Design a protein around this ligand. Structure first.
Ligand SMILES: Cc1cc2nc3c(=O)[nH]c(=O)nc-3n(C[C@H](O)[C@H](O)[C@H](O)COP(=O)(O)OP(=O)(O)OC[C@H]3O[C@@H](n4cnc5c(N)ncnc54)[C@H](O)[C@@H]3O)c2cc1C
Ligand SMILES: O=C(O)c1cc(Oc2ccc(C(F)(F)F)cc2Cl)ccc1[N+](=O)[O-]
Length: 465
């Protein structure tokens, strides 16, 4: 007999529980979720008119080894017939925009480089980049890194916007080493980003089709939530114990180095624990003897994001594309807008209606959260509608609106994040604690990364017995 408890029923926790239960000689697995539902930030709402409104991720990229692993999981879960891809022969896969100076500007795609809002090169900017010195510090902020090797314009207009689109965060506080590993390694190793990227994967039917059709992203017909739903179904089917509505309240070691997972008014013993909850939360569950680990984990915080889904009957966008990003110099509060209907017309409902999703956050939301201002649904709906009106020419009143304030939903990998992870890792091994870390708080926030962190936790835990 052997029991493994997984804390957190988000995509990372589900992936870990899934891989543990698929092993040849699986241990007893118990997945403990605090809320009434599994899936974490992956959540889909089915509107009155039949349209799908995503409240978190709304598509997954198949590129790279991780994207391939995720598609392999989709096949194993038998979700093939539900896959909705955005094929390479569409504008949602070949067009990203930046809203700057009262207008939407297409970002350079191919080698075409003569491109507003940029002054002159992108030929020239990348030219002096190949000759730019190599940073000698163990870490650097994205902004500093960007301005030093790419210039002020690329830093303020491109990297600033990209950090908001991926991490809903501030490039002046985010780590290049942790947030854009590839760019950091390129510079350190080859001494040049471009030069380094030029020097430079499971298999399945879906993966082959994704490559042949050049998918930029994919989702699922009834909403991305179908993914955690399928995982949950398979777990219950494999005899895995899933507890919902039961937040973990404490962790402590006892007889024969077994964990004591304390719930509200219940308790569970575990030979090993896989923590797939936010680092700040685990930090508080740890016993007194793990104070150093708790301190390393508490240093990892997350920003909030307010998601506003807007639908318009009979309206159209100024341009066709994936969506657009908004630099912090344009509007701290409006991170960007995704053109959901361009990518997935099949989820527009009937009668079909134009759908866009406005992501709010930045210093605007942070200062309000820190202030006594009541974060009402009205405030977010108003700012989102105004953003759509000004940035997309959609002055019409939305026919449907959904507002969700997601508290501390995207971990921020700030300067020194790598050392917070190193410290936690060394404490765990040095004290031989039967605890493994997984999820967005550590090695990546993307769903592909979270799934992989869950799989890796399962592998390391199964190896030990
Ligand atoms: C609006 C937005 C848009 C996004 N878009 C994309 C995108 O399109 N592409 C992409 O790749 N990624 C995207 N992401 C990021 C990605 O969705 C997340 O990083 C990822 O889903 C987080 O998964 P997780 O398992 O690590 O954490 P979570 O989903 O937050 O799950 C952790 C779970 O642990 C539970 N928990 C907490 N405390 C306890 C306790 N004590 N006991 C038991 N359970 C507990 C929580 O209830 C939660 O469900 C987006 C995120 C946001 C919110
Ligand atoms: O994927 C993007 O970079 C992108 C994200 C957008 O919207 C968001 C989605 C998710 C988040 C997140 F994850 F930070 F919450 C922020 C924003 Cl602004 C809008 C436009 C783009 N884009 O490339 O043109």
């Amino acid at each position: 007999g052997r029991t493994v408890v997984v804390l957190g029923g988000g995509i990372s926790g589900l992936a870990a529980s899934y891989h543990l239960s698929r092993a040849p000689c699986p241990p007893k697995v118990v997945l403990v979720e605090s809320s009434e539902r599994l899936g974490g930030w992956i959540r889909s709402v089915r509107g009155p008119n039949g349209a799908i409104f995503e409240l978190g991720p709304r598509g997954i990229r198949p590129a790279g080894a991780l994207g391939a692993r995720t598609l392999l999981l989709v096949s194993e879960l038998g979700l093939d017939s539900e896959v909705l891809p955005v094929r390479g022969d569409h504008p949602a896969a070949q067009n990203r925009f930046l809203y700057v100076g009262g207008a939407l500007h297409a970002l350079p795609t191919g080698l075409r480089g003569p491109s507003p809002p940029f002054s002159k090169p992108l030929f020239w900017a990348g030219l002096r980049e190949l000759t730019k010195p190599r940073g000698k510090e163990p870490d650097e902020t994205v902004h500093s890194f960007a301005q030093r090797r790419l210039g002020p314009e690329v830093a303020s207009l491109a990297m600033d916007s990209l950090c908001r689109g991926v991490f809903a965060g501030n490039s002046r506080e985010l780590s290049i080493r942790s947030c854009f590993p590839s760019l950091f390694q390129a510079e350190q190793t080859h001494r040049s980003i471009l030069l380094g990227l030029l020097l430079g994967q499971p298999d399945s039917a879906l993966i082959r089709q994704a490559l042949a059709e050049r998918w930029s992203q994919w989702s699922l017909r009834g909403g991305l939530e179908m993914l955690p739903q399928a995982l949950e179904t398979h777990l219950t089917s494999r005899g895995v114990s899933v507890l919902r509505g039961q937040p973990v309240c404490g962790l402590s070691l006892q007889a024969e180095g077994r964990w004591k997972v304390s719930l509200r008014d219940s308790s569970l013993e575990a030979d090993h624990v896989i923590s797939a909850i936010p680092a700040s939360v685990l930090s508080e569950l740890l016993p007194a003897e793990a104070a150093p680990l708790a301190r390393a984990l508490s240093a990892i915080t997350a920003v909030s994001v307010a998601v506003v889904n807007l639908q318009y009957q009979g309206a159209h966008l100024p341009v066709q594309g994936f969506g657009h990003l908004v630099p912090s110099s344009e509007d701290p509060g409006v991170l960007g807008i995704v053109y959901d209907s361009v990518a997935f017309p099949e989820q527009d409902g009937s009668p079909p209606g134009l759908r866009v999703t406005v992501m709010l956050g930045g210093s605007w939301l942070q200062t309000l959260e820190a202030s006594g201002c009541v974060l009402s649904q009205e405030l977010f709906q108003q700012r989102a509608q105004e953003a759509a009106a000004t940035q997309l020419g959609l002055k019409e009143m939305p026919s449907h609106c959904l507002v969700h304030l997601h508290k501390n939903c995207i971990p921020q990998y700030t300067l020194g994040h790598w050392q917070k992870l190193e410290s936690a890792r060394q404490f765990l091994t040095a004290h031989r604690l039967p605890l493994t870390l997984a999820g967005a708080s550590y090695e990546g926030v993307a769903v592909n990364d979270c799934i992989e962190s869950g799989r890796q936790a399962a592998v390391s835990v199964l190896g030990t017995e």
